[PDB]
Ligand binder design. Structure first.
Ligand code: HEC
Ligand code: HEC
Lengths: 126, 126
């Protein structure tokens, strides 16, 4: 759906921005600094699920640009494992949210955050 | 979820960018320049449904900025009608896509596009 690599870059940066917001807005809840409303969190994590599937198709071949490292494309299988593992970390968060289980939500939230970092440390430029 | 108005601006611009892509990528399909795969379009319109609910909460009071016109905030009811009407235009597109009805998809796609414009002409700066 991208006319130029710049369009893929703009899309993925937008998608990732929306993920940072839907993930990060739960930090006060997991820390107990804001109240835990199970219905609210379930709905927010469903948005995050949808968004978390979107960036990867905007790293197609030849879409070097932005802050993406070239290693994304020299080993396609490894990058794919990264994004699939991340999306499965999101599945754990979804399951926690759907169960209304604050303790599982905390644990899954931490693991999701680690997975964001695991990808950045291999694949995102400084 | 926004520390500063600039964060709300960045969020809504990102959300609207993702809408332009999930809407606009169907143009070749509705024109017949690309094949119509009902399953594919159903899934894409579900993404567009999710995204099309997101921008509006990032125009909270005091979040002037970007290319948003001030009229968004001097008549809250009128802006709300705009975004609600748009989301109901998206409902028609969802119903068409879920039915696998290409003729209804074409018609709804045109009406959605008109609704994007109706809002821009009142509420988006040049
Ligand atoms: C690899 C599988 C990634 C995972 C998992 C996550 N992110 Fe990431 N992110 C990745 C890359 C390669 C890039 C650079 C994209 C480019 O072309 O520039 C990024 C970028 C971001 C950004 C900045 C977006 C922007 O506005 O330019 C943010 C805010 C971001 N990423 C956040 C983020 C969070 C919170 C994640 C887990 C919930 C996450 N990313 C996962 C690669 C990958
Ligand atoms: C009002 C109810 C709107 C509807 C419906 C749509 N859009 Fe719009 N859009 C609106 C505003 C007020 C703004 C400016 C936001 C800001 O603070 O700058 C926009 C902006 C866009 C953009 C640019 C985003 C960016 O990267 O800065 C795009 C690409 C865009 N809008 C597309 C778009 C499409 C395709 C729509 C219908 C499917 C649509 N918008 C509806 C207000 C409103």
């Amino acid at each position: 759906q991208f006319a130029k690599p710049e369009d893929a870059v703009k899309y993925r940066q937008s998608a990732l921005t929306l993920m940072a917001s839907h993930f990060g807005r739960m930090t006060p809840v997991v820390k107990g600094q804001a109240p835990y409303d199970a219905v609210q969190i379930k709905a927010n994590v469903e948005v995050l699920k949808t968004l978390s599937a979107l960036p990867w198709a905007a790293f197609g071949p030849g879409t070097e640009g932005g802050d993406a490292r070239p290693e994304i494309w020299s080993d396609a299988a490894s990058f794919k494992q990264k994004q699939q593992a991340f999306q499965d970390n999101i599945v754990k968060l979804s399951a926690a949210a759907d169960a209304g289980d604050l303790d599982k939500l905390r644990a899954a939230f931490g693991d999701v955050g680690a997975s964001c970092k695991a990808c950045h440390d291999a694949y995102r430029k400084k």
